[PDB]
Amino acid sequence: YNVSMRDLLQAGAHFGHQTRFWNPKMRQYIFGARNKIHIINLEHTVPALNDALNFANQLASKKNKVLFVGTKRAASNIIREQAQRAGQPYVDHRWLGGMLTNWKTLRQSINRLKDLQTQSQDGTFAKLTKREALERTREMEKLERSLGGVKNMGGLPDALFVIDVDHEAIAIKEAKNLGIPVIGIVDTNSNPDNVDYVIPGNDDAIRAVTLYASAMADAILAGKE
RNA sequence: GUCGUCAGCUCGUGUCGUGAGAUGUUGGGUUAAGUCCCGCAACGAGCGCAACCCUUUUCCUUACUUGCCAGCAUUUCGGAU
């Protein structure tokens, strides 16, 4: 399930942000700048990506869970489709504060979320009139978009995967607080300090996020033990 | 009584701070209204608001006296009978 290197170049993982927005911690990985924007070498990208795939494969073999996290407008549908394909839940929309550090309250949220979904499946929602029914339906989309991923979880995920560390810094802080390992793609302008498995590459490119999510979903599915 | 029928006042778990504390109530529209919707390290609640109570406007059912008189009849022309 390795990504070779040529796939990374054809996707465009080497492109990064402008030199003026860089984070000095990525000096080792940047390797140079072709233009006023940084270009990261894939020679460092491929081994870390393969190691992340291996770790995810081992975790899936042990049947432990890897949560998906992508919120950017570019990678939202990518994490949508690939996490649905892999059967590993996700945080597609805005990362609500305290998901992991305040799980005791979110268990209740998942609770009447599931109860109202079961009511929608049942004929209970058929009895009441149209206005109140539409009110509860609006409540249903409102709750589902925020907590659609978390309903499957029965506990804290064993690992996290992150599309943008800066954009999902709150999730990184929560994972550091509770000790969950994090694998996230870290761009030029990003801080890799709290990421256990640092895979450096572009996160704006739809091709790049598609490649990353597809490869990780392939590894998770190919655990198969 | 008054501000004044003014629209605000409080609580839980998480985060931030050595700490007293803070967050949530924050911005853009709209409404009599913290009324509602989008935004938003916060998510959710409770009291306030609104509604439940009385009265008025249209119609239906029950009830036909001490109240009513469309049709019939008698009229002292007064539902008087």
CB A189 within 8 A of CB A204: no
Q: Residue at minimal CA–C1' distance from B14?
A: A102
The residue extents of the domains of chain A are 28-95+159-223, 96-147
User: CA(A96)–C1'(B50) in Å?
Assistant: 31
Residue A174: nearest nucleotide (C-alpha to C1'): B15
Residue A169: nearest nucleotide (C-alpha to C1'): B41
Helix crossing, A206-222 with A42-61: angle to 10°? 30
CB A28 within 8 A of CB A200: no
Task: Read off φ and ψ for residue A162, nearest 5 degrees.
Answer: -130, 130
Which residues make beta-bridge pairs with A66? A159
User: Which run of H or E residues covers position A15?
Assistant: strand A15-18
Cα distance between residue A41 and residue A32, in whole Å: 8
Length of chain A as a residue count: 225
Residue A102: nearest nucleotide (C-alpha to C1'): B14
- Resolution value, angstrom units: 2.2
User: CA(A64)–C1'(B69) in Å?
Assistant: 92
Task: Read off φ and ψ for residue A13, nearest 5 degrees.
Answer: -70, -20
Cα distance between residue A127 and residue A168, in whole Å: 42
CB A156 within 8 A of CB A144: no
A90-91/A66-69 β-pairing: parallel
A90-91/A182-186 β-pairing: unpaired
Q: What is the CA radius of gyration of chain A?
A: 19
Strand B nucleotides, any atom under 7 Å from protein beta carbons: they are 12-16, 38, 40-44
Taking CA atoms, A83 is separated from A16, A47, A53, A67, in Å, by 25, 23, 15, 9
A15-18/A37-39 β-pairing: antiparallel
Footprint of strand B on the protein (CB under 7 A): A 94, 96-98, 101-102, 104-106, 109, 138, 142-143, 146, 170, 173-174, 177
Q: Which residues have C-beta within 8 Å of that of residue A142, sequence separation ≥ 6?
A: none
Q: Using what technique was this structure determined?
A: cryo-EM
Cα distance between residue A134 and residue A128, in whole Å: 10
b/e string for A36-68 if b means 16 or more Cβ within 10 A?
Answer: eebbbebebbbebbbebbebbbebbeeeebbbb
Cα distance between residue A8 and residue A209, in whole Å: 10
Measure CA of the first residue to CA of the last residue in chain A; give whole Å.
16
DSSP secondary structure letter of residue A152? G
Residue A101: nearest nucleotide (C-alpha to C1'): B14
DSSP secondary structure letter of residue A5? T
